[PDB]
Structures are given as C-alpha cells and as structure tokens.
Amino acid sequence: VEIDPFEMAVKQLERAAQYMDISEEALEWLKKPMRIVEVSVPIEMDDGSVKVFTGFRVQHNWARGPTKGGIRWHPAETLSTVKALATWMTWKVAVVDLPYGGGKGGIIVNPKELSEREQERLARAYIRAVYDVIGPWTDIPAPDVYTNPKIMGWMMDEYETIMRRKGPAFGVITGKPLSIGGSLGRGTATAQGAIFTIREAAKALGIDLKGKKIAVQGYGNAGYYTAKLAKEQLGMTVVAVSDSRGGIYNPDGLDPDEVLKWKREHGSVKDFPGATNITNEELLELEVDVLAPAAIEEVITEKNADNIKAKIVAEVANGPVTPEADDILREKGILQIPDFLCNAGGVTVSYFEWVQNINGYYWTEEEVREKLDKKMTKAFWEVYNTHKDKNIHMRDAAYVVAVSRVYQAMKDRGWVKK
Ligand SMILES: NC(=O)c1ccc[n+]([C@@H]2O[C@H](COP(=O)([O-])OP(=O)(O)OC[C@H]3O[C@@H](n4cnc5c(N)ncnc54)[C@H](OP(=O)(O)O)[C@@H]3O)[C@@H](O)[C@H]2O)c1
Ligand SMILES: N[C@@H](CCC(=O)O)C(=O)O
CATH class of the missing domain: 3.40.50.720 (NAD(P)-binding Rossmann-like Domain)
Known part of the structure; x- marks a missing residue:
C-alpha cells in the first residue's frame, strides 16, 4: 500500500470535517476505534500439526446501533487495514441511514493455500475466538475479500453451537446461503x-x-x-x-x-x-x-x-x-x-x-x-x-x-x- 490505510482514513475524516461544525472531543472520539480485539486462531492442519493465525475484530463505533462489517482473509492484511475498513464501514452505514455502527474483521491467511477442511476449521476457530464480542445485537460480520457465503454458513453454525440456540443465531452474520x-x-x-x-x-x-x-x-x-x-x-x-x-x-x-x-x-x-x-x-x-x-x-x-x-x-x-x-x-x-x-x-x-x-x-x-x-x-x-x-x-x-x-x-x- 502506498500509504497507511488507517492514517489515510483519519486524514480523510479530518479533511472532510473541515467543512462542518463538529466539536473537538467528537472528532477525537471518531478518530479512534472504540474496541479492537486481536486474537490467536489455532487450527489443525491436514498433516496433523497445529498452526496459529492472527485474527482481528475491530468495531470503530456503535452509537447508531450494532456494528456491521465483513471479514477479510488476506496474507497482506494488517491491523491498520482492518481499522480503516471499520472506520469506512461506519460512514458506509451512516450514509444510507442504517441502524448500524461500523465494524470489521479479518484473518492474516492465504486462503488459496488452505483446503476445504482447513478453511472450515479456521472459520470455526475464529468464531470461537471472537464469540465474546459478536452477536445479533452486538456485532454482525459478513463476507468480504476471499470470503464467501460458504464460510459465512460455517461461522453461523459454529456461533449457533456456542450460543446453544438461545436467540436469533441466524442474525449473527449476513451473506449466508439461502438454505440456512x-x-x-x-x-x-x-x-x-x-x-x-x-x-x-x-x-x-x-x-x-x-x-x-x-x-x-x-x-x-x-x-x-x-x-x-x-x-x-x-x-x-x-x-x-x-x-x-x-x-x-x-x-x-x-x-x-x-x-x-x-x-x-x-x-x-x-x-x-x-x-x-x-x-x-x-x-x-x-x-x-x-x-x-x-x-x-x-x-x-x-x-x-x-x-x-x-x-x-x-x-x-x-x-x-x-x-x-x-x-x-x-x-x-x-x-x-x-x-x-x-x-x-x-x-x-x-x-x-x-x-x-x-x-x-x-x-x-x-x-x-x-x-x-x-x-x-x-x-x-x-x-x-x-x-x-x-x-x-x-x-x-x-x-x-x-x-x-x-x-x-x-x-x-x-x-x-x-
Ligand atoms: N464482499 C462484499 O460483499 C463487498 C460489498 C461491497 C464492497 N466490497 C468491497 O469490494 C472489494 C471487492 O470485494 P469482493 O467481495 O469482490 O472480493 P472477492 O470477490 O472475494 O475477490 C476480489 C477479486 O479481486 C481480485 N484481486 C485481488 N487482489 C487484487 C489486486 N491487488 N489487484 C487486482 N485484482 C485483485 C481477485 O482476483 P483473484 O481471483 O485472481 O484473486 C478477486 O477475484 C473489497 O475491497 C470490498 O471491501 C465488498
Ligand atoms: N462493505 C462491507 C459490507 C459487509 C456487510 O454486508 O455487512 C464489506 O463487504 O466489507
């Protein structure tokens, strides 16, 4: 990347707030993600070894409602990229007037080097890692780059298993297959x-x-x-x-x-x-x-x-x-x-x-x-x-x-x- 994604996003936010009446404290609040969770995602490879990947779940603001944003699986991903994406998510849901905040998730992984079973294990382990910060009324993930409805359904099934079917588990994540x-x-x-x-x-x-x-x-x-x-x-x-x-x-x-x-x-x-x-x-x-x-x-x-x-x-x-x-x-x-x-x-x-x-x-x-x-x-x-x-x-x-x-x-x- 030419320049840091989060720095660029903050620069855009300031550049645009120069044309509106907003207090300094509100700007400082909006220039910082509200919660960032960095987790280790351990999965078992096809050869039996255990490999640990790095996962991020960054919610930038939930003033307007539960945060929304996709999950990106990318080898070149960085925490700054996820922060910038969550910040953009916030404005994305604000501009079309949705009762959502801004959120974003990711895993530093090359999915092209992972098999089907390894991808399913990775999705389930990511859900097990970030269960405490996601939910149908807290944080709703979705598909993003190198993620698809298949992985979304795996994640939904894992969340429903952990949640013991107490509430609307189907609503914990979007971009799901039509059957589920x-x-x-x-x-x-x-x-x-x-x-x-x-x-x-x-x-x-x-x-x-x-x-x-x-x-x-x-x-x-x-x-x-x-x-x-x-x-x-x-x-x-x-x-x-x-x-x-x-x-x-x-x-x-x-x-x-x-x-x-x-x-x-x-x-x-x-x-x-x-x-x-x-x-x-x-x-x-x-x-x-x-x-x-x-x-x-x-x-x-x-x-x-x-x-x-x-x-x-x-x-x-x-x-x-x-x-x-x-x-x-x-x-x-x-x-x-x-x-x-x-x-x-x-x-x-x-x-x-x-x-x-x-x-x-x-x-x-x-x-x-x-x-x-x-x-x-x-x-x-x-x-x-x-x-x-x-x-x-x-x-x-x-x-x-x-x-x-x-x-x-x-x-x-x-x-x-x-
Ligand atoms: N996913 C969503 O639901 C959604 C909704 C709105 C906006 N967006 C945004 O739109 C973008 C595209 O998302 P997506 O869902 O289309 O991802 P995707 O379908 O999973 O894959 C992105 C496509 O872009 C190509 N690509 C990846 N890196 C590239 C690079 N450096 N230069 C040129 N091409 C590259 C890939 O080609 P290969 O097949 O060769 O890897 C891939 O086919 C994302 O940045 C996302 O934030 C996504
Ligand atoms: N712009 C978001 C949308 C995800 C969603 O549908 O919640 C992304 O694809 O990263």
Whole structure:
C-alpha cells in the first residue's frame, strides 16, 4: 500500500470535517476505534500439526446501533487495514441511514493455500475466538475479500453451537446461503447498488449509458457481478476486466459469463480468447466512460491519478482512491462516486437479511430490489445535492452526510456533551 490505510482514513475524516461544525472531543472520539480485539486462531492442519493465525475484530463505533462489517482473509492484511475498513464501514452505514455502527474483521491467511477442511476449521476457530464480542445485537460480520457465503454458513453454525440456540443465531452474520437463512438478492447486492449509483450519476451528468464503455478491476463477487449487471441493466459494453494476475481488454466488448467460465477453468482471466492481455495499471488508464475498481484498496495514487480517462469512477472497492488522487481527479472534471456510497448496496442488503433473520420472516426478490433502489437513490441524491450546495468534493459531502448522523447519535447518548 502506498500509504497507511488507517492514517489515510483519519486524514480523510479530518479533511472532510473541515467543512462542518463538529466539536473537538467528537472528532477525537471518531478518530479512534472504540474496541479492537486481536486474537490467536489455532487450527489443525491436514498433516496433523497445529498452526496459529492472527485474527482481528475491530468495531470503530456503535452509537447508531450494532456494528456491521465483513471479514477479510488476506496474507497482506494488517491491523491498520482492518481499522480503516471499520472506520469506512461506519460512514458506509451512516450514509444510507442504517441502524448500524461500523465494524470489521479479518484473518492474516492465504486462503488459496488452505483446503476445504482447513478453511472450515479456521472459520470455526475464529468464531470461537471472537464469540465474546459478536452477536445479533452486538456485532454482525459478513463476507468480504476471499470470503464467501460458504464460510459465512460455517461461522453461523459454529456461533449457533456456542450460543446453544438461545436467540436469533441466524442474525449473527449476513451473506449466508439461502438454505440456512439467506436473503434473496444478497449475491448481487453490492453490484446492484453500484449500478444504481452509476445510473443516478449518469442521470445527473446527462449521459446516456447505452452503448458506452465500462472497465472493471477485479473479478470477484463484486467485480464480476458489476460487469454483468452493467452489460445487462445499463446496456453498457464491458471492454476490459482483470484479476490479481492481470487483465483482458477488448474494444468490441466481453461477455462476462464466458470470462467467468474461463477464469473458473483456468484460475485467471488471462489469455482469454479474442482479448488482449494487459496489466491492472494499463486497465486503469484505458479510455472508458465508467471505471469501477472492485479489488484491493489504493489503486489510484499520484502515480496514475493524472492518467485516468474515465468520465465516472465508481469506487466499488473500499478506499481505492487516495485523497490526493481525489483532488487530482476532481481538478480533471471526473465525477467520483464515493467508496462508502457506491458499494452501500451490499451493506444495504445485509441489513435487510438481518431484519429478516431477527423477525423470522423472509421477503421476496422484488421487495428487496425495490427497497435497495429506494435507499441507494435517496443516499446518492443527498450526497450529490450536498456536494453541489457547498461546492466541495463528493467524498467530503458524503462524510458531511454520514459523520453528522453519527455525531448526532453521540449527542443523543451523552457520549460527548458538545
Ligand atoms: N464482499 C462484499 O460483499 C463487498 C460489498 C461491497 C464492497 N466490497 C468491497 O469490494 C472489494 C471487492 O470485494 P469482493 O467481495 O469482490 O472480493 P472477492 O470477490 O472475494 O475477490 C476480489 C477479486 O479481486 C481480485 N484481486 C485481488 N487482489 C487484487 C489486486 N491487488 N489487484 C487486482 N485484482 C485483485 C481477485 O482476483 P483473484 O481471483 O485472481 O484473486 C478477486 O477475484 C473489497 O475491497 C470490498 O471491501 C465488498
Ligand atoms: N462493505 C462491507 C459490507 C459487509 C456487510 O454486508 O455487512 C464489506 O463487504 O466489507
């Protein structure tokens, strides 16, 4: 990473609080995670040896309600990354007006080197380690990078076993399989929210998205579904995709299903027939109308900020653009959808899955789709009008929408007097 994630997040928070009336004590409260739990996760490997991994569960604030945030499994992960992600989670749930705080979990592990049984043991041991700080009304984990609904179901089963089925165990964690208390539309949640935000941004900019070009970085649960939905719902032409090993570009357009099949039959999208192999740096610099980074954070810095040529940058990923790069892009007249507003959908659907779990009653695809569209449109238009009225950057405006709400919560709890 170019710069420390938590330091960057704090810098963004201060940079944006420079445009609002907030007390010093509240700022100091908001610049520090409220609880951090570092645990050792011991599992038994396939060869019989015992290996200990490092797990983090960081909740940054729970003034507005129980904290929410996914679990990231990553070899390059650090406690600072989890702290920054929890801080961003807070604003993410505040901007779309959810009764959640901000939370984040992670394990420093390379899941590609672990078998199915080892992954299940790791998930169960992580739950056993962090049971004392999580719950349906305390902290609700969710899927994240290199984690999937499978691992979510394993974690839910372990939590239910520990909890002795005393309460709504299904609601302890979101992004679950549909058989064990899953929610319809959760699989394409973040992609649907990103597509709605892109449509609203195009509406605001007066741009017809039909026939235009979209370049997506990362081909995971968010990137692939974003490309598919953009090709299907917005009528866009997916000209380039990528994963950690590289990307494929095609001026005539790519079919996301064939690319996914190739990536599932070969391990990567590289050397896809009819496409040219490029790098992620080259993909970010392509002449496209929409650029959606859906991968690791900090991909746009002063080393490529001036080389971005997309009309709209949809930050599907968590914190993919640095504040400096934000200033450069804004100087270039490029509209940016803020990271914790563009991918609010995934956190909006998860909240829906939560409500269904705690109420014991489950909804349909149409209801979830309608509610998600309504929430995302309202949040995006609030942020847009906020940035237009005050003549400030998008990222900052969302903060003004988000942090203020969080601030209000503290003033309603007595945490800060001023
Ligand atoms: N997961 C969610 O529910 C959710 C909801 C909203 C937002 N987000 C945010 O969106 C981002 C993507 O999450 P995800 O769920 O899509 O993860 P994922 O599906 O588990 O995998 C991410 C994808 O990005 C690729 N990738 C990883 N590191 C990369 C790098 N350094 N450069 C280029 N590509 C890389 C990976 O390719 P390989 O397959 O080759 O490893 C992988 O396919 C995350 O940062 C997350 O915070 C996630
Ligand atoms: N932005 C969060 C959303 C997790 C959730 O649905 O609670 C993440 O994927 O890390």
